[PDB]
Amino acid sequence: TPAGFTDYKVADITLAAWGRRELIIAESEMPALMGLRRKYAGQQPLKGAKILGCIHMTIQTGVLIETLVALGAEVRWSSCNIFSTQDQAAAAIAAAGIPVFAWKGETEEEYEWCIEQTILKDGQPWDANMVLDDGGDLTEILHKKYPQMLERIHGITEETTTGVHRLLDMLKNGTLKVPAINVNDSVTKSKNDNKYGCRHSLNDAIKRGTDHLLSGKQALVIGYGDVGKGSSQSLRQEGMIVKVAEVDPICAMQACMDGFEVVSPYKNGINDGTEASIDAALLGKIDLIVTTTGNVNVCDANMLKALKKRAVVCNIGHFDNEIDTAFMRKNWAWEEVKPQVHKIHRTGKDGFDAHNDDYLILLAEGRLVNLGNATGHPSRIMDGSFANQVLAQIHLFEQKYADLPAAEKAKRLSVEVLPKKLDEEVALEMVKGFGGVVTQLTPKQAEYIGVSVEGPFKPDTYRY
Amino acid sequence: AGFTDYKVADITLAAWGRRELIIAESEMPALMGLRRKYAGQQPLKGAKILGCIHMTIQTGVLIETLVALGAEVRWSSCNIFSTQDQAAAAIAAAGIPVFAWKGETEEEYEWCIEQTILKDGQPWDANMVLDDGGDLTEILHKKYPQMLERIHGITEETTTGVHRLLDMLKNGTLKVPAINVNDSVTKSKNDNKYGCRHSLNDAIKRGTDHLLSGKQALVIGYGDVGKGSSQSLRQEGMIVKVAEVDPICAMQACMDGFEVVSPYKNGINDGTEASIDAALLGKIDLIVTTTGNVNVCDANMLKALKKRAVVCNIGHFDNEIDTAFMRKNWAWEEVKPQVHKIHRTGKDGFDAHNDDYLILLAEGRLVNLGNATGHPSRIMDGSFANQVLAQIHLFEQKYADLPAAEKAKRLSVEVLPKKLDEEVALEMVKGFGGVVTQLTPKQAEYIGVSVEGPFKPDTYRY
Amino acid sequence: FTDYKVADITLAAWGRRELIIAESEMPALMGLRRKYAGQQPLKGAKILGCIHMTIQTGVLIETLVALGAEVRWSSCNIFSTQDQAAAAIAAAGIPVFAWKGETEEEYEWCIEQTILKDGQPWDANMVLDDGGDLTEILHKKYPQMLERIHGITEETTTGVHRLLDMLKNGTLKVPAINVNDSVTKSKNDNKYGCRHSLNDAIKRGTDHLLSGKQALVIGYGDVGKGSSQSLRQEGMIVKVAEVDPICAMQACMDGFEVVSPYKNGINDGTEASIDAALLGKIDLIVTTTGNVNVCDANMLKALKKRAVVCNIGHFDNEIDTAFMRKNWAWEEVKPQVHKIHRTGKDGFDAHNDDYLILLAEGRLVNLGNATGHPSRIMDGSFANQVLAQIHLFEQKYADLPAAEKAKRLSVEVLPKKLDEEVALEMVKGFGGVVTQLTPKQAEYIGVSVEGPFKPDTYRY
Amino acid sequence: GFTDYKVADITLAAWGRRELIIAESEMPALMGLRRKYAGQQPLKGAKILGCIHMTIQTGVLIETLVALGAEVRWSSCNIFSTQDQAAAAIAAAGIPVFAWKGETEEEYEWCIEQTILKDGQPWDANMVLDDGGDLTEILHKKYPQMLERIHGITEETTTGVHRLLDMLKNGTLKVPAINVNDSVTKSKNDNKYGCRHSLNDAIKRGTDHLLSGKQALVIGYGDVGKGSSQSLRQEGMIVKVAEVDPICAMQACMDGFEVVSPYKNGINDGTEASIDAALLGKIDLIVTTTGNVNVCDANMLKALKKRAVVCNIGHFDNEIDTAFMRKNWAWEEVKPQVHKIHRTGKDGFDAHNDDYLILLAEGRLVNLGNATGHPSRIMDGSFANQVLAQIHLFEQKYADLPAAEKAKRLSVEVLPKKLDEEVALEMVKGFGGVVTQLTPKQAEYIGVSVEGPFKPDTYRY
Ligand SMILES: NC(=O)c1ccc[n+]([C@@H]2O[C@H](COP(=O)([O-])OP(=O)(O)OC[C@H]3O[C@@H](n4cnc5c(N)ncnc54)[C@H](O)[C@@H]3O)[C@@H](O)[C@H]2O)c1
Ligand SMILES: NC(=O)c1ccc[n+]([C@@H]2O[C@H](COP(=O)([O-])OP(=O)(O)OC[C@H]3O[C@@H](n4cnc5c(N)ncnc54)[C@H](O)[C@@H]3O)[C@@H](O)[C@H]2O)c1
Ligand SMILES: NC(=O)c1ccc[n+]([C@@H]2O[C@H](COP(=O)([O-])OP(=O)(O)OC[C@H]3O[C@@H](n4cnc5c(N)ncnc54)[C@H](O)[C@@H]3O)[C@@H](O)[C@H]2O)c1
Numbered sequence A: 001t002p003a004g005f006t007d008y009k010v011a012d013i014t015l016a017a018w019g020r021r022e023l024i025i026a027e028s029e030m031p032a033l034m035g036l037r038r039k040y041a042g043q044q045p046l047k048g049a050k051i052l053g054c055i056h057m058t059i060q061t062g063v064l065i066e067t068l069v070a071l072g073a074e075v076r077w078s079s080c081n082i083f084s085t086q087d088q089a090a091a092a093i094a095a096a097g098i099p100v101f102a103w104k105g106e107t108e109e110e111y112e113w114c115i116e117q118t119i120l121k122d123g124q125p126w127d128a129n130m131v132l133d134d135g136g137d138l139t140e141i142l143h144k145k146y147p148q149m150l151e152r153i154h155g156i157t158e159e160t161t162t163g164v165h166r167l168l169d170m171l172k173n174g175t176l177k178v179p180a181i182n183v184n185d186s187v188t189k190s191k192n193d194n195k196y197g198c199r200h201s202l203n204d205a206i207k208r209g210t211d212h213l214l215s216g217k218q219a220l221v222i223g224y225g226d227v228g229k230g231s232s233q234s235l236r237q238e239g240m241i242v243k244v245a246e247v248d249p250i251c252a253m254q255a256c257m258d259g260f261e262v263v264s265p266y267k268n269g270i271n272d273g274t275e276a277s278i279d280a281a282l283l284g285k286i287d288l289i290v291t292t293t294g295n296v297n298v299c300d301a302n303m304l305k306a307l308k309k310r311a312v313v314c315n316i317g318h319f320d321n322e323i324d325t326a327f328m329r330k331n332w333a334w335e336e337v338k339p340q341v342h343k344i345h346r347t348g349k350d351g352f353d354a355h356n357d358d359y360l361i362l363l364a365e366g367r368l369v370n371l372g373n374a375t376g377h378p379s380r381i382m383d384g385s386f387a388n389q390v391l392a393q394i395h396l397f398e399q400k401y402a403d404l405p406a407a408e409k410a411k412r413l414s415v416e417v418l419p420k421k422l423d424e425e426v427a428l429e430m431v432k433g434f435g436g437v438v439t440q441l442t443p444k445q446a447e448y449i450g451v452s453v454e455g456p457f458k459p460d461t462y463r464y
Numbered sequence B: 001a002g003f004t005d006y007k008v009a010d011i012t013l014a015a016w017g018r019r020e021l022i023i024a025e026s027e028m029p030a031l032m033g034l035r036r037k038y039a040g041q042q043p044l045k046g047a048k049i050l051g052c053i054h055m056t057i058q059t060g061v062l063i064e065t066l067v068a069l070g071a072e073v074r075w076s077s078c079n080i081f082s083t084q085d086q087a088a089a090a091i092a093a094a095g096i097p098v099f100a101w102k103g104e105t106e107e108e109y110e111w112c113i114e115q116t117i118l119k120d121g122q123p124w125d126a127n128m129v130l131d132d133g134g135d136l137t138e139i140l141h142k143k144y145p146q147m148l149e150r151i152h153g154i155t156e157e158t159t160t161g162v163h164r165l166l167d168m169l170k171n172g173t174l175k176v177p178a179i180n181v182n183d184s185v186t187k188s189k190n191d192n193k194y195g196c197r198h199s200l201n202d203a204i205k206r207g208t209d210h211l212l213s214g215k216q217a218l219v220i221g222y223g224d225v226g227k228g229s230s231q232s233l234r235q236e237g238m239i240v241k242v243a244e245v246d247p248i249c250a251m252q253a254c255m256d257g258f259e260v261v262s263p264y265k266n267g268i269n270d271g272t273e274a275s276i277d278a279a280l281l282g283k284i285d286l287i288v289t290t291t292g293n294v295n296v297c298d299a300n301m302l303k304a305l306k307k308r309a310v311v312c313n314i315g316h317f318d319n320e321i322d323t324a325f326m327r328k329n330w331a332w333e334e335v336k337p338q339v340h341k342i343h344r345t346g347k348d349g350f351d352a353h354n355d356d357y358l359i360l361l362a363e364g365r366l367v368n369l370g371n372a373t374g375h376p377s378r379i380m381d382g383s384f385a386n387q388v389l390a391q392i393h394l395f396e397q398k399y400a401d402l403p404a405a406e407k408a409k410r411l412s413v414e415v416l417p418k419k420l421d422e423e424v425a426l427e428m429v430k431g432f433g434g435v436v437t438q439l440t441p442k443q444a445e446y447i448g449v450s451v452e453g454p455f456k457p458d459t460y461r462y
Numbered sequence C: 001f002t003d004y005k006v007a008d009i010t011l012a013a014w015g016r017r018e019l020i021i022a023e024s025e026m027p028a029l030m031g032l033r034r035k036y037a038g039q040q041p042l043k044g045a046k047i048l049g050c051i052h053m054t055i056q057t058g059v060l061i062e063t064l065v066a067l068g069a070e071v072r073w074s075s076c077n078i079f080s081t082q083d084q085a086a087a088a089i090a091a092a093g094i095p096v097f098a099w100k101g102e103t104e105e106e107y108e109w110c111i112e113q114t115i116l117k118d119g120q121p122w123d124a125n126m127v128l129d130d131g132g133d134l135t136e137i138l139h140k141k142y143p144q145m146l147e148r149i150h151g152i153t154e155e156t157t158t159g160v161h162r163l164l165d166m167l168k169n170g171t172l173k174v175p176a177i178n179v180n181d182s183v184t185k186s187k188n189d190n191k192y193g194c195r196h197s198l199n200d201a202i203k204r205g206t207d208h209l210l211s212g213k214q215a216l217v218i219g220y221g222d223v224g225k226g227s228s229q230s231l232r233q234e235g236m237i238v239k240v241a242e243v244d245p246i247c248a249m250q251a252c253m254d255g256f257e258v259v260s261p262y263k264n265g266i267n268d269g270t271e272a273s274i275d276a277a278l279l280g281k282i283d284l285i286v287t288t289t290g291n292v293n294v295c296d297a298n299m300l301k302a303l304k305k306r307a308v309v310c311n312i313g314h315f316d317n318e319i320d321t322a323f324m325r326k327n328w329a330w331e332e333v334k335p336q337v338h339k340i341h342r343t344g345k346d347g348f349d350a351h352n353d354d355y356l357i358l359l360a361e362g363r364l365v366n367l368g369n370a371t372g373h374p375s376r377i378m379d380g381s382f383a384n385q386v387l388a389q390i391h392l393f394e395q396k397y398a399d400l401p402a403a404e405k406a407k408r409l410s411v412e413v414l415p416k417k418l419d420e421e422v423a424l425e426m427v428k429g430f431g432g433v434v435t436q437l438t439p440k441q442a443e444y445i446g447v448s449v450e451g452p453f454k455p456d457t458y459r460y
Numbered sequence D: 001g002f003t004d005y006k007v008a009d010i011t012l013a014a015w016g017r018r019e020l021i022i023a024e025s026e027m028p029a030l031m032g033l034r035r036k037y038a039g040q041q042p043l044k045g046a047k048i049l050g051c052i053h054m055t056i057q058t059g060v061l062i063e064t065l066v067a068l069g070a071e072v073r074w075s076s077c078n079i080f081s082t083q084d085q086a087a088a089a090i091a092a093a094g095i096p097v098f099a100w101k102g103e104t105e106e107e108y109e110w111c112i113e114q115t116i117l118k119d120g121q122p123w124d125a126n127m128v129l130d131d132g133g134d135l136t137e138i139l140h141k142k143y144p145q146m147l148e149r150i151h152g153i154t155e156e157t158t159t160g161v162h163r164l165l166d167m168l169k170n171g172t173l174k175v176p177a178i179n180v181n182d183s184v185t186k187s188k189n190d191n192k193y194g195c196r197h198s199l200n201d202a203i204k205r206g207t208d209h210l211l212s213g214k215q216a217l218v219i220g221y222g223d224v225g226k227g228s229s230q231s232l233r234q235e236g237m238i239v240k241v242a243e244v245d246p247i248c249a250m251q252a253c254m255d256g257f258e259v260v261s262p263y264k265n266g267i268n269d270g271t272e273a274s275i276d277a278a279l280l281g282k283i284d285l286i287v288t289t290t291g292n293v294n295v296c297d298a299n300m301l302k303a304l305k306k307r308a309v310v311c312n313i314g315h316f317d318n319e320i321d322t323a324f325m326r327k328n329w330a331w332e333e334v335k336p337q338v339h340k341i342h343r344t345g346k347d348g349f350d351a352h353n354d355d356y357l358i359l360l361a362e363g364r365l366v367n368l369g370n371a372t373g374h375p376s377r378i379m380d381g382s383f384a385n386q387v388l389a390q391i392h393l394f395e396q397k398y399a400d401l402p403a404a405e406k407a408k409r410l411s412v413e414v415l416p417k418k419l420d421e422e423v424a425l426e427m428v429k430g431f432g433g434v435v436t437q438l439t440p441k442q443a444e445y446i447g448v449s450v451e452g453p454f455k456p457d458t459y460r461y
């Protein structure tokens, strides 16, 4: 709305009214996040905050952005994946006068340029003092290329498992320069978003990309962590015959008890570098493989060579290197079906026969498939994650780490989670949004199990 | 040969029990793997274990594993209805002291525990405790403190017993260190959840043979037991509603596809009949308590339940349901053992054709063990492999022999290391024929783990 | 009263307590008591009955009696009787000959005690049968008794097949109602009943964890559908075998892998034809077909060690148990549970690992190792039985002239309106509320507001 | 220079062709027929008027009929169900097709008329393929002289079969028909499992709403209501089911659903007082599946929970009283086929009003309107049956029979069970399933031929 506003780059500004209509619907689906908006708007806890944000530019992220703004923050925003932006969301945010650099279908060069447009304002570093990140890419660029900016930054609030792992590695190596909150490991994040979000959105993305029947076909899910658990359910509930691979025997035990057969792409689970260690009989019967690990090369070249003709290959982990797509680019001919859907023809590199039967279907070029081929998690799930983000931003901004003397800084340089009481308060708003009614303990009951009537209700060791 | 140091229902059930133990051994690869692994080393040689836990076939395989590793034991059940009499017979016939039968009275329950503590009228030379619920642990602390001086530790099975240990620790009255066996993931997220998934609808079917599909259930609680219990009923086609005091657990119930409700209007339990959601409770065909808390199916709830509803409890203790109110006010008609019709027409007599009754299972005691056989061998494999590792560790640590200054540093309630949790899990996975993938060194490097594990930080929730 | 034989008459009070509970679970059947008690439509009926002597059958028996009938009763399986139900029925002065654990010889003796009273044929005039055994004995050994019987009401798929074979052969002597193919029987009992009771029986017999293990269900008709769901809902990885490609299509769409014990599905009699890799991974095999030898000797030899074998079809020849009696050593675990040692015939090692577990000696496992279907499901089947008994009794086929008998000799089903009326009482038992069409809506879809709501061709 | 078509955008043809080639690999029964019959050309001389959703799946059906010798002229049977890339691919292949996504009612009627007429005169049609009966109705009302030369109708769906049986009852049906709907590989495949796949699909594409944990009411529990109820329950919705048929209601209970009525005691007397307001005020999503009229009526729409989603997956939009909503409430388009209906009044709305419903596809079939309908591997079964039905009626040549023989053949019939089984077998092989072959002894034991059929015609599966 601001006169003359040009400080953005999006696909199509004319999508803004549609984006705004969907933001208004989403607000009604996000009671925890809108509750925080209503509760804290008057107090303006983020007045003076200048937030660099790097997370999938969806309608759900739009509601998050406008909550931070309504609480007083200024922001400059980019997406954390080349294919995850909803162009109507980016348009509505830019049309509101909020700097955003994001569109569906960026090149890698454009992706990096978008992050840098958040970091730079008018050719010079913005006076940022907060960071909100999803996967650690903006965190990495600041530390690597703009270290002096971190001298003014009070904290990082990191959304996802892969990003937390990168923060923990930096902390252990002494290279993290500001404190962080691990938003991923709130229960109303990890055990909501990572699991139930993928349950909703994995089969959604496969249907939108291929319109394949899933019932009666064979799937292999690589990984059975939170995303693998949700992904396996997304497919089993459609009637797929789902097999699960894992390296963690505890997660494998859960998959067995959950009714899945646990298998390995490699004979006896051992990859010895050769095609002979591939279980070709197993891979020759798989119609769909989904990677969920956060690890590297878990659907490798030899597996891709052995998959059943016309199998679908996709990744719902944060980064595309779960699958060896580089091998497929090097060796096989790609036929675009429509955006983010490619047939990969195993007959050769140069041409392909339009009627060749020996191809695989790759979704979102191996990038996060739920966001690449559909719209990621639904608003009512992202509500939990993004309520935690707002609370984490408020906490670190109020702590003012950048203003402490060097001695006090060493003491607070940590990666922490939000306290369980706040996790419970977020969950309560989510439950109320379904119309659920939580029972209140009597005093005698709360004494009996050793809790306060108001919570928290579990020790910090509890796993849910 | 000359063995009389036991008390069971019927020793002639021993051959039957032995046949079922031999089957159970083939369903318990983690526990039988520990037998093979440690039999030559005899890590429990010299251990003298007081054991108090449901005297089932699965507990029989645990006992014989401890004995095969060198231990001597004296055993009792931790519930009056949970013993399988053929299991107790097989154990006694093997020359092992066991005092347990299905259908004990409260007095007999206490006498059975005392027969493990005392031998020939004097304290046994016990030096280890294995407990399920804390009753043996409490009796030792209140009545036999001199015995605790020589006891190296307690390995506690279940959530309720852990809570009691932590209360003693907080108050400075815990006298020996403990391992919380419950919170291994191969226990809590296997036994507590999947075991109740298997055995709740099992006990309900054996007790009543009621169709469950199409009927309305209310599960009180959505912890590990409440999660498994709700799945037990939902997979049968029940329409399951869930009650909770923990909004995070309630959030999971919502996302898992259940409607979350309270027995009380707006969830406020002010003690009045007016606070009961009578419309809701009048539609419930089955209520199951799963909390470990007190009076979560209270008298006013019982008064308002739909005629002929089934009432049962799968938490550790019967006081989850106000059965005392029912004993005081209503007439009980035994249908068969552990199945009572409770007639709400009054306390003195009943009409055999009265329609206004509830069906109570196991007099409100743990229903999976009271009306069926508790969890299956292949699930208990996980819990009891952890039990054996925990016994080995505390016995080898020899707390009772440490100087006072060193005892002060080791008096705690700990869990097993994650590496051992994973090793138990791998044996369970192999039992299903599952094939775990091995990380390459670069993949292990990439995610920050050793190739052999552990694979997750200790904060990980699974 | 001494005209009965049961395991233990002192179980009568227990059985009566369970009958009173069952009545509250059987609203369609108890509704028939209330509504026809005044008319006494079965006054003068003398019913020979042959069906599993369960608590559920007890409520059926007492409904027939409440409507005016006399009966003489036996079980249709050696292991399906609940001894407390038989005791209660006997204690009520009703002739019944049935106990759990009959021998084959005793089974036949029991049916004969219903046929005979004081050493001569009873003056029976109605037949209620489950599986066709009593029907067959009457035609083969007591043909003159059929001259006085107005009809047969047959419960189950196997019995109906046998009825149709006789009709086709011109050897059926009295008309019959196929109770099996009411929708409130076939698509309730055969399917949902096995869903409730198959996992129930396996748990009672073995207490095995089912989650995470591999099952093979042979067949995917109504029993195979319900059986597959019984196992899948427990977390088994279920594979389905079928000869009918339409049923196999349903299994695929329902989320199962469809496999054959034989390579390429071709059962040529050789061990070479067995898919040994498949069978060596199966922890549980369940037959559901009503066919012969669908779990055959070569399959049994190839099965994974310690697999469970059971049958939930009507007859035990679905599994080649005779081969196992001939060749392998049987170790009873407890009643209706046997370890079958594949090490040889004469003796076994108590600790041998190479055995299979057979439930109920291959007889119907849900009734043999548990209690069969639950009351609220059997409500549907047995309401249809009562209505079919009333319908045939009132038509008095035995009294017709020879010419009117030829036209009257058939196998029929009950009309759809009655099927719907049974269903309505079942729905109300769940507290369900059925909506009533407006006149305009009924006109729009071409039905009466009263129904029937579907053409006779509709498959639900 | 081919111009005998009308589609949204012919330049979508290449994209449509890529998707047809994928769909062929997902449709083994239909492509099996294409390969089996191509040499014989059993439809040589057939001239088929076709009216059915112009999807990619219909494209494979069309090209199978053409490959077997037929000529066709095609339109969609719903204003929102066409996939424009499918229509473009068919037109670019030289096949007359008049269809686009988003037709008006007038355009819909014009498209059917463009198949019926060629160069302004009746086409020399001799076969009809219909989905819902609209083309069949127009021919009987307006083009009887064309029906004299038509050999048969093959009708896809429950609603259209009902319309055929009404005509047969009334003595107004002019040519015989095959009820394709009631093949088991159609009714118990397409109607049920197709809606299982595509109902939650269309709701997600229209709204992106979380379904887990929310309350749904499914009106009806026939084949479509069974599949729809499962579509929502498998996502974690809490599903309640309404029915007028107590046998279908019994199935719903046994399947684990609570059976409820929108009306107190089930009595629909037309009053607001009759609405169970407590029930409707808890419902987040209502789906109609009945083929009936006004089963989501104005008084239910008034009582629904704020922001509930309303949609219909039966053939026609009159299942929901959208006319009432047009007359009384303000419509706000969110995006194509998604409207907020503001219950605050007719004259405009507050952009931030909280009291609205979300209507999908303006009440038209939601799986096709907001997504792509059933998937190829499911439509394989329905469309293999269509091809077989077309061959059968075309070979019978009803239009050339004498009057006395027509009278003996004027009927609505289903395909024989042996064909139903052979279609199913190709579908099972497409999954890699392995069907067992009976031994001679087993075939004798159950009284069937080793090759089938395996069930009596009375069998319900
Ligand atoms: N697409 C989404 O919307 C979304 C949502 C949340 C998280 N994520 C991403 O998904 C990834 C996984 O997240 P998570 O929370 O489930 O983490 P997690 O640690 O809970 O689970 C990852 C699992 O992969 C297993 N694994 C690792 N290497 C393997 C291998 N070679 N073979 C088989 N299994 C292997 C591990 O044992 C572990 O259980 C991360 O990149 C995370 O950032 C994506
Ligand atoms: N029967 C069995 O085989 C078996 C197995 C394992 C554990 N247990 C016992 O079951 C009980 C629960 O164990 P757990 O591991 O699930 O514990 P938990 O802490 O994981 O779960 C208990 C749940 O009850 C809830 N709760 C407490 N008070 C409540 C109230 N008034 N209304 C509603 N919900 C309420 C809590 O919020 C919690 O989520 C303990 O007694 C434990 O020892 C029994
Ligand atoms: N135990 C119970 O409570 C119970 C209940 C109802 C019926 N039954 C009995 O169960 C049996 C099946 O009854 P139903 O109603 O399902 O009959 P059905 O005709 O519906 O199903 C039997 C199925 O077996 C399949 N089949 C036959 N031979 C096969 C083979 N060699 N391999 C694989 N599949 C094969 C057929 O194709 C058919 O689909 C009958 O004997 C019936 O009397 C038992």
Ligand SMILES: NC(=O)c1ccc[n+]([C@@H]2O[C@H](COP(=O)([O-])OP(=O)(O)OC[C@H]3O[C@@H](n4cnc5c(N)ncnc54)[C@H](O)[C@@H]3O)[C@@H](O)[C@H]2O)c1
Binding pocket: C435, C437, C441, C453, D157, D158, D159, D160, D190, D191, D194, D195, D219, D220, D221, D222, D223, D224, D225, D242, D243, D244, D245, D248, D289, D290, D291, D292, D295, D313, D314, D315, D316, D365, D366, D367, D368, D373, D374
């Ligand atoms: N969208 C799709 O892809 C698709 C697919 C197949 C069929 N259809 C259409 O869907 C509709 C239903 O087809 P079907 O095969 O399920 O029909 P069906 O006859 O099998 O089921 C319709 C059901 O609606 C019930 N019903 C009727 N009026 C009712 C009312 N007022 N309240 C509640 N229930 C009521 C009937 O009792 C019946 O069980 C038809 O119009 C058909 O053409 C749509």
Ligand SMILES: Nc1ncnc2[nH]cnc12
Binding pocket: A055, A056, A057, A058, A059, A060, A061, A197, A371, A375, A376, A377, A378, A382
């Ligand atoms: N819709 C969404 N918006 C933002 N981040 C997401 N991560 C997963 N789904 C998402």
Ligand SMILES: Nc1ncnc2[nH]cnc12
Binding pocket: B053, B054, B055, B056, B057, B058, B059, B195, B369, B373, B374, B375, B376, B380
């Ligand atoms: N079968 C079993 N044996 C011992 N303890 C148990 N707790 C639950 N089930 C049990």
Ligand SMILES: [K+]
Binding pocket: A058, A060, A375, A376, A377, A378, A379, D208
């Ligand atoms: K979304």
Ligand SMILES: [K+]
Binding pocket: B056, B058, B373, B374, B375, B376, B377, C207
């Ligand atoms: K057990």
Ligand SMILES: [K+]
Binding pocket: B209, C054, C056, C371, C372, C373, C374, C375
């Ligand atoms: K029963």
Ligand SMILES: [K+]
Binding pocket: A211, D055, D057, D372, D373, D374, D375, D376
């Ligand atoms: K489609």
